[PDB]
Symmetry: D2
Subunit: 371 residues, 4 copies
């Protein structure tokens, strides 16, 4: 009395974004992270205008921009031949390690006074406003946020209709030193998406995060016993990416690299009663448009906006989904099409349609940076 | 009544910005333009993050972004050799025709209900809150804004201490078709600053505004009777910029081109009683950093911010100048140094110091996009 | 006066006829087809072949109207993987008819007797050549220069290892369309390799300001790539930067898909019979030395016949002196073909260039690598 | 009946004449004024014409081994590449001068040419007499004045000439390639690097082989820094920073010289039994890189005309008539290029510029058409 209370399950980008945005609006917010430490996995990440605008709204933009990188261009190669160079007509974008982004959100959530619990796993949620932890402890609140990832127990304990999919193939994602000097002549501040189908299917997404750190995604079929191996098989990667040898040598030193498969989900509904699902829990998607976390953050931020309208929580949640979900649905669908067709291999695929989610400004609720 | 009243002298970028920002804050605003038509001269213009943020604050950003251009890179040439390519670490920037920008500000000021008078010339202002027109008509107001350009009569009728300066050399600025196809192979969406000292001092700043329009600045010494001639001496320009021949041919058709010299002013004070000087009236500068209008817009917008603090107008004006002027002073000084030393000819000159003004966010009052 | 009968009016036969005639031989040459003509569109010659032409007095007629690219470039999947200029070693590209005309005109100026529609059907080491008219000709020397299907060779019975590939290529002369090709380095040789999305290759070879020589290589089991007249779409699809030239190529109704063919013989001579060119040593074309070696060998035969020996002895000395250069070139070129080595670029090594470096006039290797 | 020739001068022209004469059964003695056989000027370009002479001298393969043909002849103006030329296959070659000189000396020695160092011709007589600085008077059927632009064979006789020296010059050096240190680029190319701004400074960059680089540093004599020897490292690195590793080695060369350009044109190349060849007769501006080329073609051609059964006197007249217009035209065009700085524009090796290079002295025809 009379403070609205929110329990947030999940300490990833969506959960942290929701917790900050609610807390800024005067909610009493508690956040539960299942693992032993607040931490992001996946090495590196791209954000665009939409996600950057969310960060502005969270008061964490400038902490993220300091120590992250915008390449001079987004370049695509096919068999070492440059097939496209894209700068998106000025649309802002940024590459950073996941921990850089995650640290900035943690720092902000903590500074705002978000109640943070780790080793705290949500195992059940009730639409009347109850969150049950693995300890058996039952929490009552006016709002429950399921931001607990693609394997969401908040979602599955309630039983939402879904269409869930797991990929055949996967990739290895790593942070290594830039080795820029050792790379010699070239445009080594660029994003370079290096595709190959001959002599083998192997791809590297080359992604500078700053002056010190390079984010690499190494993509090879699961049925390729060498290309999919971790720690990496140096020989098969150097063979097809010899110009990256200095960085690949450093990558081969990382004993805890993982080969991860892609996973998606689409839900009929994102809400039930006082429970809202946000992020991968609601809309895990293919990463072709690099909008999974971007949409997760736009959605979590937009949830806080609809909760300011004076409505009941239940009504605000229905209004939220109705307003914001089509942007995500369209983005998820197009990114799935790109993934299935290997569209990015052709270059020049960041079309106006592809950049729709990136152009969205969640703060002013309009589309900006026209294409 | 209790409705604060502002009289704004000058219908340029500074005047229009001040009128919009004040009107949005509930001022009763009247704007006076000396000439017979609201219109901008000078062909094309660059804005950066700081000015784009002002546009966001004026509710005119997206009208400007639609139909303007961000080059993939800002390139510098010396004797046809590329000596630098700069993308400013993601810092937003934009090139556009002056009429594109000016139309967007006029549409917005008009839409908001600003009282617009043309053929209305301010010839005297009084710090107690009086503006006199050339008609002899005397207007009383709570705030007087001198946005009447480098030859400000609002300023000179009051007698501000100044250090005024006029260049010996100048340039011809024009809008022509892109002729992109005709330019053949190259990077013709780039900004390209093409310097030459041999065989003659001639420079062209090549600045695409959109798919249809190209902004060209043709710089030659005033003592050069061919290079400084208007309409342009096609031969002496084609001779040193042969790759631009299709565009230069179009430029030669422009009968109303002008050769304009540069002009600067620096004032000990920007305010006196209820009178505030904004834009070129207060701080006309060398255009090396392309920040003259950017600073003018930031200062005009920031004026409206300080007027929301519940102070007397007089105190608010003093607080405004104290808060905002050092950014402009430093920018003016550095741009003057660059101009005197021809620093831009070396390339790579958009350093962190050069970009200080561009990095400023007038909305949040912090510096963004670190360099 | 010594008499020679030469079977075959290709590069090897014409070279032999001219070289012998210059040395005072009385020479008649027999061409099986009804007109003197060279097939195969375009051809590369190197230092060795150019030196032969100098020795034949036909160099300048060949250099006028032929082309040396600024560089020999190799692409893999449109990526430039090498540019080679061979440390100044001279080389030249030309239409086959240009080279063939220069040789025919020289032979005619010298008084070589040429009979078209005259086929050698049998030969005898004692010095007899039988024509398809049944006429038996007697001579001090018989030159079997009658190509890979040599009847001079097969009527005598030379032990050989003869081979034909299942795959082949289409060779055409088209206009340069240089302006329509827009920006690039369109005076270069460009060997444009691809294995993905399909196995298709174009050897791009400018012959002069007007004529471009193209070799379009696709497997026989590819019904589109191997089709004649060309399936325009499948070629434009993988070589879109060549569309103006391919459009012209598509108009060529008489285009052929020719298979590769090689032979290696234990012996090149039998009594007064000498086999030269494809009759003796047809090879894979990777090193572009088939005619080069043929011409060096035919020219060298005339040299050994000036030593005062019996023809029989001179022929043995000729083979002993000159064949290892050809054997090594043939073996390396076959290795390159089998391993698709040219696809890697930078493959014109000192070893690859051995034949090209040979100067048949001074009998030394020049242009070191 | 053994014909006898005395050749004054042991540079490219003298050695070429001596070899060619000797090959044709002349008894040949050659006199070199300096105390040792040696070529100065660091490096040198030869073209088809000069390479053909070497073939005719039986010295081609010794020259080709250890010399270099660039992939392309490139020109820069203010660091911008303005042309790349390969001359439609026309053979050319860059080498150190000592490499060329050594091949010629070794060949003359193998043929039995009698060479006297520290032997200066101080006077000549058209009747066939050569006077040495020992006062010895030599008699011969042919006297070859191959004694350079300051020819005493020429001046003792008195040939009408127009001789000229420039105020400006250049520094020519051989340095290591430092190819790895040069990093990314096309460092096997010839690169003629022109600048007029901020200062008039030019470097002709000329690789001779895997180990040696030939540099020509051209600055006006009135520039006390650019014309300084040993080189003012700073002013060269300033305008050619991409060549710093090579220039650092260049700065170590204490015996560097600033040499001035010299030309001469004579109304006549012959007098009685005396023939003037090379710089003695036709020193020219170096734009077309044909000074030694022409000298060698002319020296080789002289031996050809002496094989016709004429008197030496008649053969010399026929020689000059046959061969001089190629040299006259080359010299005139080269001087025009030098005066107009034409090479700075690129693409200047036109058919006309390449006329001398295209000439084949062995078959007496023009080859490699342009
Ligand atoms: C290969 C790949 C590349 C990608 N690249 C990009 C990109 O460049 N840009 C971009 O925007 N997106 C990208 N994405 C997508 C992005 O990773 C996801 O959309 C994003 O991380 C989703 O965040 P989230 O907070 O919803 O889920 P998660 O990041 O999975 O976080 C949920 C948090 O859930 C905690 N948790 C789980 N279960 C419980 C529980 N029961 N109780 C309490 N806590 C729990 C998890 O441990 C964790 O701390 C990429 C994805 C993949 C697979
Ligand atoms: C060559 C050059 C290039 C430049 N490029 C850029 C650039 O790329 N980016 C950038 O941000 N800046 C640039 N600038 C600077 C920019 O042009 C100015 O700073 C800007 O236009 C100043 O706007 P203002 O409204 O203060 O003045 P002005 O634009 O001069 O406008 C004042 C308005 O004053 C009206 N007026 C005048 N007198 C009276 C009066 N007595 N009563 C009523 N109205 C009056 C004038 O007619 C006009 O309508 C450049 C300047 C130059 C010279
Ligand atoms: C695809 C391909 C590309 C090649 N590219 C090059 C290249 O770039 N450079 C190069 O040097 N080589 C190249 N070659 C090889 C070159 O084509 C041959 O080595 C050369 O043509 C052999 O010439 P020849 O005179 O021995 O035989 P052929 O050219 O076959 O000529 C023999 C002549 O034989 C006449 N004839 C045949 N039978 C009789 C008979 N019974 N009686 C009388 N006359 C007869 C034939 O009709 C014809 O006129 C290439 C070969 C191929 C297949
Ligand atoms: C800067 C520059 C660059 C050049 N680059 C090229 C180039 O790239 N390619 C090219 O072909 N040419 C080039 N040349 C021109 C070339 O150097 C000359 O044309 C060539 O060296 C002339 O040779 P020569 O034998 O006539 O004279 P020299 O080389 O001058 O030789 C005469 C020889 O004369 C000996 N001697 C002198 N006086 C007497 C005497 N009285 N008695 C006996 N011996 C005497 C001299 O000491 C010496 O040993 C260049 C010239 C210059 C200036």
């Amino acid at each position: 009395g009379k403070t609205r209370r929110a329990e947030v399950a999940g300490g990833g980008f969506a959960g942290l974004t929701a917790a900050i945005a609610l807390k800024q609006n005067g909610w009493d917010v508690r956040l539960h992270e299942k693992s032993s430490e607040l931490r992001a996995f996946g090495a590196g990440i791209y954000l665009w205008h939409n996600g950057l605008r969310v960060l502005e709204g969270l008061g964490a933009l400038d902490d993220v921009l300091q120590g992250s990188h915008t390449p001079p261009t987004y370049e695509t190669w096919m068999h070492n031949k440059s097939v496209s160079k894209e700068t998106f007509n000025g649309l802002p974008w940024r590459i950073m390690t996941r921990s850089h982004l995650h640290d900035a959100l943690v720092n902000r959530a903590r500074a705002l006074g978000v109640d943070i619990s780790v080793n705290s796993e949500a195992v059940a949620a009730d639409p009347v406003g109850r969150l049950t932890l693995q300890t058996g402890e039952v929490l009552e609140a006016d709002l429950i946020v399921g931001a607990d990832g693609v394997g969401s127990k908040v979602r599955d304990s309630i039983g939402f209709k879904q269409d869930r999919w797991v990929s055949k193939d996967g990739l290895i994602r790593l942070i290594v030193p830039r080795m820029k000097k050792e790379l010699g002549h070239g445009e080594w501040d660029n994003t370079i998406d290096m595709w190959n189908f001959w002599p083998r299917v192997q791809r590297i997404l080359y992604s500078p995060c700053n002056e010190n750190e390079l984010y690499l995604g190494l993509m090879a079929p699961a049925a390729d016993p060498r290309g999919s191996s971790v720690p990496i098989d140096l020989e098969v990667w150097v063979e097809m990416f010899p110009f990256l040898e200095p960085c690949l040598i450093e990558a081969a030193k990382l004993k805890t690299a993982r080969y991860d498969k892609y996973e998606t989900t689409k839900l009929d509904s994102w809400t039930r009663g006082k429970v809202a699902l946000v992020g991968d829990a609601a809309h895990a998607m293919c990463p072709a448009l690099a909008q999974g976390a971007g949409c997760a953050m736009v959605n979590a931020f937009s949830l806080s906006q609809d909760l300011e309208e004076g409505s009941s929580v239940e009504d605000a949640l229905v209004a939220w989904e109705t307003r914001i979900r089509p942007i995500t649905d369209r983005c998820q669908a197009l990114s799935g099409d790109y993934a299935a067709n290997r569209s990015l291999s052709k270059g020049n695929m960041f079309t106006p349609a592809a950049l729709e989610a990136a152009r969205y400004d969640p703060l002013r609720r309009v589309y900006s940076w026209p294409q």
